[PDB]
Design a protein around this nucleic acid. Structure first.
Lengths: 275, 275
DNA sequence: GGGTTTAAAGAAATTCCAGA
DNA sequence: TCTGGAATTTCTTTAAACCC
């Protein structure tokens, strides 16, 4: 008797809304989820068939998961966390309306004290280790599913192991935003490589970013310095040479990449040409 | 005697700082101010020689000059205005440390009530008129010099006419900002005109901006819609054809321009080439 | 001539608010 | 409504100062 995540929540593309931004802090989507046939984070209770209760709470991306300041808002959420009873019904439990409301940095402290003075601690993490405000990440959280089964006749106390979902990063924050190449001025260049390209893109961090050409076992970096990143939304760089040379146009894949976590943007075709 | 401005304050390129930003709201420089030989807003008392006092305060850009909410901070500034004495000494009066602290839109009201409950009203502008909150531009102010001469044996009461300087636009705002082309991908194209250019620039407003090519009586606009403006700091457009054809390379002047006020950025050479 | 109070450029954190 | 360009307010690497 344990819990299992059927479909993990998408990690990029969702903004954490502030309280000042309405009540719909959004609805976190699933991984697979598509525009047409969209899906939602869902889990299933293996080794069990019966009435019960589940509690979705937000936790850190840190090895020893401690409650997070941000709130989970939406249908069946109160006090920053979702809780609901579920029947022996369909195996898969989907959770549609699950938004993330983020607290202003000021609220950060006050916020965690209440998680303590509330019992919200699915991992019984050392209370004092929990006041470790200076070190947390308000740009990324994790969903902590906590299913409690029926006790010796009566309510739900038999709690199953707290399962934790993949991390979800706030797309509004520069260091967690999804990588996206908006526009380029040239989709091809010489194999000698040295062509100067202008990439318009979503906010990145000149500190932690790199354009990366790739094909099979081959891969090279676009060539540019930090000064070439314009107001975080544009990169002026030069194409790297291709290994060897060729006689016919050879298209490779070009893409933004973030070293720190190696996250990459959707690729784009770049055709190398014979001199 | 009265007061003449020996040097007007530069109108563009200075940010209005918030209180949260510290004690230094910068230092307003005067037009003539070069880089190796920088200058400052200065005025001189004509028709007079002797000890005295002067008071620099901020006023609106509206015909009837009323005190402005923003504060003037810096050496000898207090309660939002600068005041100082000055013996019969040197004619010219330069004011270096003169910064502009801007109030949050919330503070706007509360702010003006205190200018009233303070006497700050160099132009004796009517009461309920000086309450035109929803008509004050927080992006532009004017310096109001008010020199007071010595009275019949005593201090300074003989107040000379309030002089007002040229406007000073809050570079924090895009429509009051200085226009600046940071970088371009091509400095030349065909006279047929149709070459796609990427301009990296300082924050502009897609709503109110246009690239203008010009030479003598000739002038044409770069071609692009709003969607071509990337996050306010980059423009992808196409060069306009040059009038007639040409035998040799003919360089013209390229520059960002803001229709609403016809303010323009510093020009840049664009050479048209014969097909 | 390059090393450590500070203030401009620059990125961040909010709050705004209308287009899709 | 949900999404996402942006005007606003805050604060961090730089960038007017000093160190001597």
């Amino acid at each position: 008797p344990y819990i299992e995540i059927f479909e993990q929540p998408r990690q990029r593309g969702m903004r954490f809304r502030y309280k000042c931004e309405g009540r719909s802090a959004g609805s976190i989507p699933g991984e697979h989820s598509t525009d047409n046939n969209k899906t939602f984070p869902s889990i299933q209770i293996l080794n069990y068939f019966g009435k019960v209760k589940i509690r979705t709470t937000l936790v850190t991306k840190n090895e020893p998961y401690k409650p997070h300041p941000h709130d989970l808002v939406g249908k069946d959420c109160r006090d920053g966390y979702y809780e609901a009873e579920f029947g022996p019904e369909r195996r898969v439990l989907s959770f549609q309306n699950l938004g993330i409301q983020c607290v202003k940095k000021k609220d950060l402290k006050e916020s965690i004290s209440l998680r303590i003075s509330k019992k919200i601690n699915p991992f019984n993490v050392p209370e004092e280790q929990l006041h470790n405000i200076d070190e947390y990440d308000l740009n990324v959280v994790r969903l902590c599913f906590q299913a409690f089964l029926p006790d010796e006749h009566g309510n739900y106390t038999l709690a199953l192991p707290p399962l934790i979902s993949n991390p979800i990063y706030d797309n509004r924050a520069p260091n967690t935003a999804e990588l996206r190449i908006c526009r380029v001025n040239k989709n091809c260049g010489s194999v000698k490589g040295g062509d100067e390209i202008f990439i318009l893109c979503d906010k990145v961090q000149k500190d932690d970013i790199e354009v990366r050409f790739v094909l099979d076992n081959w891969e090279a970096k676009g060539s540019f310095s930090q000064a070439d990143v314009h107001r975080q939304v544009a990169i002026v760089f030069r194409t790297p040479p291709f290994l060897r040379d060729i006689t016919e146009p050879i298209t490779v894949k070009m893409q933004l990449r973030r070293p720190s976590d190696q996250e990459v943007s959707e690729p784009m075709d770049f055709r190398y040409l014979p001199d």
